[PDB]
Design a binder for this molecule. Structure first.
Ligand SMILES: Nc1ncnc2c1ncn2[C@@H]1O[C@H](COP(=O)(O)OP(=O)(O)CP(=O)(O)O)[C@@H](O)[C@H]1O
Ligand SMILES: Nc1ncnc2c1ncn2[C@@H]1O[C@H](COP(=O)(O)OP(=O)(O)CP(=O)(O)O)[C@@H](O)[C@H]1O
Ligand SMILES: [Mg+2]
Ligand SMILES: [Mg+2]
Ligand SMILES: [Mg+2]
Ligand SMILES: [Mg+2]
Lengths: 284, 282
């Protein structure tokens, strides 16, 4: 693959460590932060598994390239560098000490670890909306939004991650039977499968399920409902029930994200504004 | 999903158990053996994960359909039934108490040690299964120790038909063909030419042989997937395993012949392995 100095990082400056969670591992990167040339830094490294397929490699490359183009943002996991020459491809990204959001929330469920306050949940949701709002402004569709794909930092900052299925808005083959076949069904917008398209509004549908996972503290969507029976139920108007401790207002937000008609759903900008209000009013 | 009465099995007679294109769990099936209507049989059931994708569903469906087509053979995991109506798809297959071959072998490393004859016997059984598979015009495409199951009586059983296809159902020369086959068990032509024939499967059999004789070793140790095909193109081949005779290693090299038609057929492999096994036994 093409050499790209600006992002290349020395293999001898990286010490691979313990497994995290193809295959992702923790590691120390000496001087990865150019202003601290000798300072070792704890990072995360994504690389291929030993039994990886060709598609796994093209996916890893795609993920790296997408992260390069997206740019930097508070709520998006950051690319730190990559080892792409004379050796196995290593994609180095910022290390999130708290793990993924799904595991994070479940570990903080009431004893029935520090519990999540209603404000923490709204704040978590608001941060992600901002992240998605930015992504959309960069013409990027994630396509795989879910609690298991969000990382939490030491200071509880939410980071959208796993861009292994992400695409530039124009890099989607509309109407082909093979388009969107690798998207987890339970987080997927109906038009993704039915019409074989994908827009930012398809991402808002996913965001809706993410909201539900957040307010159920890491629950599994459509419990008891098999994936092969889901789209039938969705066509019939079925939608997940309101999470226990969730305001009717936040629930209507989820419901709005699940409008059958894409343009009928809120834009991420609208979600940010609404959530900003709710968060603020909760604070006061 | 079209109803196929012949294979349909009642859901109320199936009790899912502990965990083992999906996820496999142990289960108890009452009357799966039609001659013993009230008997509970321990089986294995493959189903979709909660986060399954559309492709995960079509693969499981394809897996089921491929197993129905293939027919029965002692060295191929057998289909017992399937719950396809009004509910999640369940593919019910025979339970293999010893797990997959790779785990089985790594456990028997110098937990009852494997003898040279056992290893050959193991290899011979798999060749027999592949010979039958090839005769049914089926290409497995994902042959490897991790895809071989071992029954209570140490019978080898080729499994995981999640990538298998009929020999004529291949999108020839398309750049997207064979994109989901583990690279280290994959025949060179499968990637360079985008084709897949029974001879591609024999190449994988070779790797499988190497895993067997190294007692579950990982192929091309120390070589990343990204670097393997250039090496393979240059002639690189894995070295002989210690607990392996030059003859058996030569069989591996034959399976890895660069030219597809120059690799032996499964029919020829079975004949040679039988001869070798017969000698090792007598
Ligand atoms: N930067 C990071 N810091 C901390 N943990 C990380 C991390 N990147 C990944 N992980 C951990 O590894 C898990 C899997 O990561 P990721 O979502 O990137 O998976 P993956 O693309 O390798 C496979 P899949 O698509 O099956 O998830 C995360 O849910 C998280 O627990
Ligand atoms: N019939 C059976 N009896 C016993 N164990 C079984 C079994 N079927 C599957 N298993 C166990 O589950 C493992 C995975 O099986 P299988 O190879 O079918 O996986 P899979 O198709 O679900 C996913 P992948 O393609 O990622 O392996 C096997 O290696 C074995 O340990
Ligand atoms: Mg992920
Ligand atoms: Mg991924
Ligand atoms: Mg398998
Ligand atoms: Mg499989």
């Amino acid at each position: 693959l093409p050499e790209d100095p600006k992002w290349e990082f020395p293999r001898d400056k990286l010490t691979l460590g313990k497994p995290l969670g193809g295959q992702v591992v923790m590691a120390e990167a000496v001087g990865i932060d150019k202003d601290k040339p000798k300072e070792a830094v704890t990072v995360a490294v994504k690389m291929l598994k030993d039994d990886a397929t060709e598609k796994d490699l093209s996916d890893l490359v795609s993920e790296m390239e997408m992260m390069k183009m997206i740019g930097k943002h508070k709520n998006i996991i950051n690319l730190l560098g990559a080892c792409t020459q004379d050796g196995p491809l290593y994609v180095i990204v910022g290390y999130a000490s708290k793990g993924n959001l799904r595991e994070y929330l479940r570990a903080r469920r009431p004893p029935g670890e520090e519990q999540m306050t209603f404000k923490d949940l709204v704040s978590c949701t608001y941060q992600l909306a901002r992240g998605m709002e930015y992504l959309a402004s960069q013409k990027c569709i994630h396509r795989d939004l879910a609690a298991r794909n969000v990382l939490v930092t030491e200071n509880n900052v939410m980071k959208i991650a796993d861009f292994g299925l992400a695409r530039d808005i124009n890099n989607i083959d509309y109407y082909k039977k093979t388009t969107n076949g690798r998207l987890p069904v339970k987080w997927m917008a109906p038009e993704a499968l039915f019409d074989r398209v994908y827009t930012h509004q398809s991402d808002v549908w996913s965001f809706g399920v993410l909201m539900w996972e957040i307010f159920t503290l890491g629950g599994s969507p459509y419990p008891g409902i098999p994936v092969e029976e889901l789209f039938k139920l969705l066509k019939e108007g079925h939608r997940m029930d309101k999470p226990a401790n969730c305001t009717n207002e936040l629930y209507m937000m989820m419901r709005d994200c699940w409008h059958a008609v894409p343009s009928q759903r809120p834009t991420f900008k609208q979600l940010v504004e609404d959530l900003d209000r709710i968060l603020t009013l909760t604070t006061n």
